[PDB]
Amino acid sequence: DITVYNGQHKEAAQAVADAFTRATGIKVKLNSAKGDQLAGQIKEEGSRSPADVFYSEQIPALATLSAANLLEPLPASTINETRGKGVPVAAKKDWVALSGRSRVVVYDTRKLSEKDLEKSVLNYATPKWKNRIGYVPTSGAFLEQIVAIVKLKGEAAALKWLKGLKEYGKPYAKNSVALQAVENGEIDAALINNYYWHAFAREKGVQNVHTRLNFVRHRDPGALVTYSGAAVLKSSQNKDEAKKFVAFLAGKEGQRALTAVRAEYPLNPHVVSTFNLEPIAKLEAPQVSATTVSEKEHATRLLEQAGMK
Ligand SMILES: [Cu+2]
Ligand SMILES: [Cu+2]
């Protein structure tokens, strides 16, 4: 019936495809890769691509496929489903945002409480946090964070943050490696994404975990939410059933099914997650424009300037 190109978590995607099929009876086959490569691969088959729907963890990928006249404009009702202040809107109305995932601080509740954390993510790059703040200089989510500080605060502020993390902080190879470092009692705190912790708590049993999360809010760069979205390709030979799916994904049903398996924040406001997430608006994420190639470029330079790459 339909084929979706999936740059999102397979378990997530499958949950949503299964929920869709059950509800309409329409079959869904998934092509799972990193969004970047699926946007790329779509471009090259132009309008003979087998993709009906592009299910992206990355809005920038939705934007390349849009600037390239490859995406089908969606009903207002669909787009309207996840509208909220702060929510990215397609200028052309040819993709829709679905959920977000946030920057957080995980901390060791055996030695730190909320009163101990900082009001700004920028404040961690200092002697006070010497040997007490971990980071993942190699992660994409870290690179997003750098992008957002340059857009919010300018270039020197970003570079200054990174040099102070480099002198004081402690690097880890993976976000999961660092999480386990706080849980293991090796450092007080670490900058990660939220879903790693929720997944871990859900598997272990929260009474058995000694870490908790801090959200900075206050429109701080550290309150950064990264959004996922979806679009239907203008080449689809299944456009009514492809549009149906995207509507599903934006709808109540689609959204509860998502947030049954994944700790992403629903953009649909009627949806309560199975995870202990506040409403996204309460995160008070900063307004930030889409990340471009140049920006990631800019940021990677900054990383190499600070001594990280
Ligand atoms: Cu991730
Ligand atoms: Cu990751």
**Structural method:** X-ray
Looking at the fold, whether 5 and 88 belong to one and the same domain comes out as: yes
CA–centroid distance, 24 to ligand 2, in Å, is 33
What is the total residue count of the chain? 309
Q: Where are the alpha helices (DSSP H) in the chain?
A: 10-24, 35-44, 59-67, 76-81, 140-153, 155-168, 175-184, 195-204, 239-250, 252-261, 280-283, 293-306
Supply φ then ψ for residue 289, to 5 degrees: -70, 170
Resolution to 1 decimal place, in Å: 2.1
CA–centroid distance, 120 to ligand 2, in Å, is 23
Structure tokens, 116: 């101990």
Looking at the fold, whether 241 and 219 belong to one and the same domain comes out as: no
Looking at the fold, whether 267 and 286 belong to one and the same domain comes out as: no
CA–centroid distance, 179 to ligand 1, in Å, is 13
| Residue span of the structural domain in which 26 resides | 1-101+226-277
Among the listed residues 106, 104, 103, the one whose alpha carbon sits nearest the alpha carbon of residue 210: 106
CA–centroid distance, 175 to ligand 2, in Å, is 6
Contact by Cβ (8 Å): 1, 24: no
Looking at the fold, whether 63 and 130 belong to one and the same domain comes out as: no
Looking at the fold, whether 32 and 97 belong to one and the same domain comes out as: yes
CA–centroid distance, 140 to ligand 1, in Å, is 8
- Give the CATH number, domain containing residue 249: 3.40.190.10
Binding site for Fe(3+): residue ranges? 9, 57, 195-196
Supply φ then ψ for residue 193, to 5 degrees: -100, 160
Looking at the fold, whether 51 and 97 belong to one and the same domain comes out as: yes
Per the structure, the count of domains in the chain is: 2
Looking at the fold, whether 149 and 264 belong to one and the same domain comes out as: no
What sign has the CA pseudo-torsion 8, 290, 198, 270?
A: negative
CA–centroid distance, 25 to ligand 1, in Å, is 30
Binding site for Fe cation: residue ranges? 9, 57, 195-196
Looking at the fold, whether 250 and 300 belong to one and the same domain comes out as: no
- For residue 226, which ligand has an atom nearest its CA? 1
